[PDB]
Amino acid sequence: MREIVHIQGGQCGNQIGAKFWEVVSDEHGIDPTGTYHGDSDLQLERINVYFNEATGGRYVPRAILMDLEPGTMDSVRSGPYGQIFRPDNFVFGQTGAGNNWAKGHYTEGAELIDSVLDVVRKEAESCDCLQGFQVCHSLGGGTGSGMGTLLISKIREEYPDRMMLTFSVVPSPKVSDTVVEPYNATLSVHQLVENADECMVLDNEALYDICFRTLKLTTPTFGDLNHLISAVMSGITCCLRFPGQLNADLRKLAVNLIPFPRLHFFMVGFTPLTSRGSQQYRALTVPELTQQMWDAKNMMCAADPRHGRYLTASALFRGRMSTKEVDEQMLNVQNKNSSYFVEWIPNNVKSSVCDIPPKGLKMSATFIGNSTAIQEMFKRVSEQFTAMFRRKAFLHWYTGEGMDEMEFTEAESNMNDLVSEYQQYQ
Amino acid sequence: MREIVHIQGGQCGNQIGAKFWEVVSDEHGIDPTGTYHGDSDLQLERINVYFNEATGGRYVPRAILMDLEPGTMDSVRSGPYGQIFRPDNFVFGQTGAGNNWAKGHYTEGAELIDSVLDVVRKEAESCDCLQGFQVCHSLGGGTGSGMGTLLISKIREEYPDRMMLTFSVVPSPKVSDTVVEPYNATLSVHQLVENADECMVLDNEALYDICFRTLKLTTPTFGDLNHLISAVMSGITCCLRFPGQLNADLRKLAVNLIPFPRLHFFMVGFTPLTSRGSQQYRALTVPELTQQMWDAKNMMCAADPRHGRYLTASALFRGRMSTKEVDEQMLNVQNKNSSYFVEWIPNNVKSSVCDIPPKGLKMSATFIGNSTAIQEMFKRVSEQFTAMFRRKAFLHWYTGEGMDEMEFTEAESNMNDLVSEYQQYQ
Amino acid sequence: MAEREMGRLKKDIGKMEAERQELADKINGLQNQIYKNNEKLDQFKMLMN
Amino acid sequence: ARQQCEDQLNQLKQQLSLEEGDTKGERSRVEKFQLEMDRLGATLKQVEEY
Amino acid sequence: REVISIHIGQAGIQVGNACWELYCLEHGIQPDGQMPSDKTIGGGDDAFNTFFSETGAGKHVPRCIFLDLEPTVVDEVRTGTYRQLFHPEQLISGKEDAANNFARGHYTIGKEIVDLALDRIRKLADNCTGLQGFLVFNAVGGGTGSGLGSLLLERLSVDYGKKSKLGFTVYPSPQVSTAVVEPYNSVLSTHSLLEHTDVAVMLDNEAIYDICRRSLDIERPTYTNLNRLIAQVISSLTASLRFDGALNVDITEFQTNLVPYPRIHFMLSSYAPIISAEKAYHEQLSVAEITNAAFEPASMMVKCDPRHGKYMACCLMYRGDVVPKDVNASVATIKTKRTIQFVDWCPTGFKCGINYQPPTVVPGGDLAKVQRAVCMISNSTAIGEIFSRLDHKFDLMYAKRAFVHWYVGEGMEEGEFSEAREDLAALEKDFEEVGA
Numbered sequence A, B: 001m002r003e004i005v006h007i008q009g010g011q012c013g014n015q016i017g018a019k020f021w022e023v024v025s026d027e028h029g030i031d032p033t034g035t036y037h038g039d040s041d042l043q044l045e046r047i048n049v050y051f052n053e054a055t056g057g058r059y060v061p062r063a064i065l066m067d068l069e070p071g072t073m074d075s076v077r078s079g080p081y082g083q084i085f086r087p088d089n090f091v092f093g094q095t096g097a098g099n100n101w102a103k104g105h106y107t108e109g110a111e112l113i114d115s116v117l118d119v120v121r122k123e124a125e126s127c128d129c130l131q132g133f134q135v136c137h138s139l140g141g142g143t144g145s146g147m148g149t150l151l152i153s154k155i156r157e158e159y160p161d162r163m164m165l166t167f168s169v170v171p172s173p174k175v176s177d178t179v180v181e182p183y184n185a186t187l188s189v190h191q192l193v194e195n196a197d198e199c200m201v202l203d204n205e206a207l208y209d210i211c212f213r214t215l216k217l218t219t220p221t222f223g224d225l226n227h228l229i230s231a232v233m234s235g236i237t238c239c240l241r242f243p244g245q246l247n248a249d250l251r252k253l254a255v256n257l258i259p260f261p262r263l264h265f266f267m268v269g270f271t272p273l274t275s276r277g278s279q280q281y282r283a284l285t286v287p288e289l290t291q292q293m294w295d296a297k298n299m300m301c302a303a304d305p306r307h308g309r310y311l312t313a314s315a316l317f318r319g320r321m322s323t324k325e326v327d328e329q330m331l332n333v334q335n336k337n338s339s340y341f342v343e344w345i346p347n348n349v350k351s352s353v354c355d356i357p358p359k360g361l362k363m364s365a366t367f368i369g370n371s372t373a374i375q376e377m378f379k380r381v382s383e384q385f386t387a388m389f390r391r392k393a394f395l396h397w398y399t400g401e402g403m404d405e406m407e408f409t410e411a412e413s414n415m416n417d418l419v420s421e422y423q424q425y426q
Numbered sequence C: 001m002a003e004r005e006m007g008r009l010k011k012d013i014g015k016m017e018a019e020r021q022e023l024a025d026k027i028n029g030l031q032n033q034i035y036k037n038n039e040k041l042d043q044f045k046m047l048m049n
Numbered sequence D: 001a002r003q004q005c006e007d008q009l010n011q012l013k014q015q016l017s018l019e020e021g022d023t024k025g026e027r028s029r030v031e032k033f034q035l036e037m038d039r040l041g042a043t044l045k046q047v048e049e050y
Numbered sequence E: 001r002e003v004i005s006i007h008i009g010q011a012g013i014q015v016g017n018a019c020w021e022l023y024c025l026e027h028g029i030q031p032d033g034q035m036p037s038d039k040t041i042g043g044g045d046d047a048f049n050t051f052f053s054e055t056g057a058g059k060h061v062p063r064c065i066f067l068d069l070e071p072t073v074v075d076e077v078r079t080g081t082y083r084q085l086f087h088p089e090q091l092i093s094g095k096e097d098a099a100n101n102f103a104r105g106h107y108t109i110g111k112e113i114v115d116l117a118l119d120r121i122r123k124l125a126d127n128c129t130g131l132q133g134f135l136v137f138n139a140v141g142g143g144t145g146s147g148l149g150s151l152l153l154e155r156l157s158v159d160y161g162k163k164s165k166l167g168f169t170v171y172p173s174p175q176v177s178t179a180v181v182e183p184y185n186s187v188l189s190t191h192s193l194l195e196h197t198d199v200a201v202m203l204d205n206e207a208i209y210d211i212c213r214r215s216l217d218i219e220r221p222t223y224t225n226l227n228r229l230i231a232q233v234i235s236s237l238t239a240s241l242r243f244d245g246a247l248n249v250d251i252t253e254f255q256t257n258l259v260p261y262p263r264i265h266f267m268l269s270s271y272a273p274i275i276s277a278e279k280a281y282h283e284q285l286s287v288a289e290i291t292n293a294a295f296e297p298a299s300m301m302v303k304c305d306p307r308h309g310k311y312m313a314c315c316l317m318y319r320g321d322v323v324p325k326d327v328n329a330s331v332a333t334i335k336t337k338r339t340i341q342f343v344d345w346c347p348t349g350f351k352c353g354i355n356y357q358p359p360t361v362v363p364g365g366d367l368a369k370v371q372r373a374v375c376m377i378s379n380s381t382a383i384g385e386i387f388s389r390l391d392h393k394f395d396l397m398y399a400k401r402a403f404v405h406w407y408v409g410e411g412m413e414e415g416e417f418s419e420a421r422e423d424l425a426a427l428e429k430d431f432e433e434v435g436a
């Protein structure tokens, strides 16, 4: 009865969501032909949260794709577990944004959003007890950020009190594959400050560092990063789909983590994230899970938690474990580190448990922290934006598209006041 | 007991009727050789509403074909389901109308209507308990419009108390098939409005758009437009032929849809309509059928159903449904947008339920709206008539065969005051 | 060429002038109906009190 | 003659563009007013039920 | 649904030579009169009945009369590749030519041959049941097309009247013309061409030379080349009565749809795609671009810019595989185009007839094999320019009374010279006011 409408913006969001739907279909035990081929009944009492039924037992995701190039949709169609998608959601343009955020927020929005909003409205009135939306995107590009941001604002204006999760991968200095990252990132986070209700920040720098350190892989392609993000995505929503001994729904997680309205940027991790070789040598206990949690070499964001203070933390465990062990481990960590955890919120950590573990594994645990160290990414993006905008570099591609130095200065000022609030509370 | 007489005037009417008899023959399970191979025994019970069973099992339909060129008969008798018509039902002439309403109504009608009435009277007196007449024709033609409405007047003068259904395909703004359509359209509508009991108005642009937007076809031809119109007609004539929880025959439909004697011009629609590749992705669920019915992109007219108000509406469902369900959405759709329905009529909509879904489906629905937004097509035709008659264009082709200009002036006045009386109900 | 263009442009401007007048009448009607409906809502508010 | 012809053609063109932009604005206002109409209708229905 | 055709002069009978060179192969008739016993191309026994009428066992005779006064060309037709096809009496040949003298062809010589031609026209309409109308092929740019052509035209009009008359008249060219005295015969024939012929189709020599030089790239075309595509256009406009299409319009519809006023029947003509044998395939051919080429003034059979005029009505005859949707899609873009402008006295101006039969290629021809074709025939006001320039040509010859004696000494007084020019002027001013 609880509802999470999935939306995938841009190529990065589309591929990440495709892997995520593969993961969720695998978890619920349904073939890529749409039918059900699982064993346990417990996979079937909560399919309605992430799958609409069709005639004949064919389950189809409640997902909507959005981009401007047919090639991404072609790739998603060609890939496995791609046919399950309803072809009534493959909405797209024919020109491509060109990473011109002004173009993707002012010049293709007017021709694609009037349809994508209709599709999302239909999918949101399909079911009754809406909890919210899950939008997967990149705050670096043109059409993954412009259209995604305007669409998030539209859903904000249409559903005033439904929760939006924005799973946003943020560009990094060492993974800057395009030259115009800051002009789009600043302008996107500008509006994501007002619009969304929780934004989880991801970055390819920390993703590659994890794939080189924890997994110690040799050739980590985009597929494995998408798999990591998808596993986190499917592990953060276990309480809605599966029974637990201490549940944790969306608004509970929010109201626990965010103290003040503007402070809704999170860093997320995952345990156990272990290499194939060294996995066979390790037995999995709750202290092991929490060590691999808190260790900074496991955060999926390139933000170092021991460079600041934890506002709040949250741990979603999955496995038939013991609540006394969970609570004592969390408080053990809190007593070990008495400065990295904020002074005026007693026991700022929140913990919850679910029964069914991810397939294959026996125990798992996702981690969401509202650390204040995340200001470093924002201040670095602001520094790069000021460096590029101090001489109007690349600016004409947006100035002739509709925006102005007034809006750019406004975005920079909003970033400055965001890091100001973070430093003030730290 | 009850009986229906089909009439086909014009080339468009003949093709539409051929497709209609194809559909009805498939539905009752008679093969194109005139014999019977249906399985169930709920079909022979009402098989006599259309087919006069002859000695030898040759169930021949009760439809009469009329036109001024044997080419249409060649086509109909050659095409599939052609060897079941009657040789007597092939009355014709060998001159041709050539789009001139004067030739249609005076030059050739005055000597072919005797032949058409002979067969019509023979069939009407061979069928005991008549229910009505229904004719499929083209308003922009010369044989289906002129001679058509001439026969309409003749038969209405003959039988007063038997109702008339006219499936009339009207001119179009975008697909301008002919040059002198507005003259024929005005001269046929001016005759019809007195003798029209129910007038299902159709047009080809609103069907091309359906086939290119909803059904998502590549080559939408007449072999598809006539199929859609046939589906709608069979949906109209379902309560007579089949049992159900809540019957509604032609008289019930007319009484529920005509609130004033000069308000009879229905916009039709059929649901469900799905793309061939997405058939098995959405469930034929009664709500889904309802918001497919109450749609603008699923009408069969150039007029915008949201560009005015609905006076009355009727919905004939077919299949195994639940009346509580059906009526709950019938009331919800009327409570939602209260500005599109007439304020001074509670219960704007009727919802009849049959109990045999059509072959190849699980359930279906046919919509018939007597809305006041239908006046826009009449306004377009009337302003075209002003633009032409302002210079007596093509006037000699009429005035040289038995016409005066008084008919033209009175037709202008009639169209003007009819659109005025539609307007003043708003 | 020039006379063709002016003929086409005159026809277009006449058609779109007519559409503009229709839009003006639509706006006037909508304003009147919103006035009536808001007055009715005020009456209903007082009745609720 | 032809240069005068084209000059008047151009000034008609600019006037038509002006009026076309005006009608676009009018259409936007009409859509907003339809929104307001339907919202007030819904609120009135809720109050009547109350 | 049968139609008979008459061919007068030399241009008429050569155009008819091309037409009956094409119809025989299109219906599969071997060029001697009998269908082949072994192979059966196409089908439909009634399909060929419009132009060929069966006789006896297996010989099919045409429905045309080739009448001319000079025997030099009728004898060539008699002895050529078509000897057993035609009928020995349907080839009427006098003794002496009209010699470009319109008066001589109208009064002296023509008076003793028009009745003989009528004696066979009547006996040919006797054995035809569903007669549709008459089709005349002639060039008024001489003495037999103008004189005898007119004489036969009005003598048929007074006798039948009800049956329509489709003419394909080859007027004198803008500049590239043969005879020196055309500006007399042209007006002398138009005076009786206004109010007698029903639907006239204007043809030019120069424009079709231009088409053959820019489309088939034959830098030195000839009368055979021109008459071949003329016959192709005739077949593409008469295909409706013979081959069954979804939206098919015969002679009566073509007439009642394109003539808004009594005497405004003066049309253009175009055909698409005229493409060489080598470029039959390298160009993408489809409805959109063939229709686009059907309107370009460089692809018009009469050398006059349609941009000078305002269209009143148009008809488009489609051949072969043409779904009736992209035709409307194309005419929508035609309406949205800017160069071509209609008249406000008509809001809907297209009649898009369609037939399911691809065009035929004559053996060893200049036209390639295409899966489809378009024949465009439209009324327009730009023909007033043609009549005005021809009026200017007539005035100079008349003010000096040149060449007049060759007429007045053969039977025509100055009154006809005066009144034909007056009525052509009335035609031109009527076109002015209608375009107004």
Ligand SMILES: Nc1nc2c(ncn2[C@@H]2O[C@H](COP(=O)(O)OP(=O)(O)OP(=O)(O)O)[C@@H](O)[C@H]2O)c(=O)[nH]1
Binding pocket: E008, E009, E010, E011, E012, E014, E015, E069, E070, E097, E098, E099, E100, E101, E139, E140, E141, E142, E143, E144, E145, E170, E177, E178, E179, E204, E205, E223, E224, E226, E227
């Ligand atoms: N397109 C085309 N034009 C032709 C053809 N034959 C002749 N013409 C032109 O049409 C005109 C008709 O020829 P005429 O001079 O009238 O010869 P005629 O028609 O036999 O009349 P007389 O010989 O004078 O009795 C000529 O001036 C040529 O310019 C032809 O085969 N095709």
Ligand SMILES: Nc1nc2c(ncn2[C@@H]2O[C@H](COP(=O)(O)OP(=O)(O)O)[C@@H](O)[C@H]2O)c(=O)[nH]1
Binding pocket: A009, A010, A011, A012, A013, A015, A016, A097, A099, A138, A140, A141, A142, A143, A144, A145, A169, A171, A175, A177, A178, A204, A222, A225, A226
């Ligand atoms: N995880 C993942 N990241 C990607 C992929 N492709 C690109 N990226 C990164 O994420 C960002 C995506 O930008 P992009 O989607 O192309 O912008 P858009 O075209 O406006 O949607 C880029 O800056 C890349 O560095 C992918 O397939 N997977």
Ligand SMILES: Nc1nc2c(ncn2[C@@H]2O[C@H](COP(=O)(O)OP(=O)(O)O)[C@@H](O)[C@H]2O)c(=O)[nH]1
Binding pocket: B009, B010, B011, B012, B013, B015, B016, B067, B097, B098, B099, B138, B140, B141, B142, B143, B144, B145, B169, B177, B178, B204, B222, B223, B225, B226, E247
């Ligand atoms: N939708 C549809 N329209 C048709 C069909 N056949 C003909 N028409 C239209 O009907 C019009 C002519 O009407 P017609 O039946 O020929 O009347 P007639 O000329 O007197 O024979 C044409 O403009 C066609 O566009 C058909 O099968 N389906």
Ligand SMILES: [Mg+2]
Binding pocket: E009, E010, E068, E069, E070, E097, E098, E099, E144
């Ligand atoms: Mg000669």
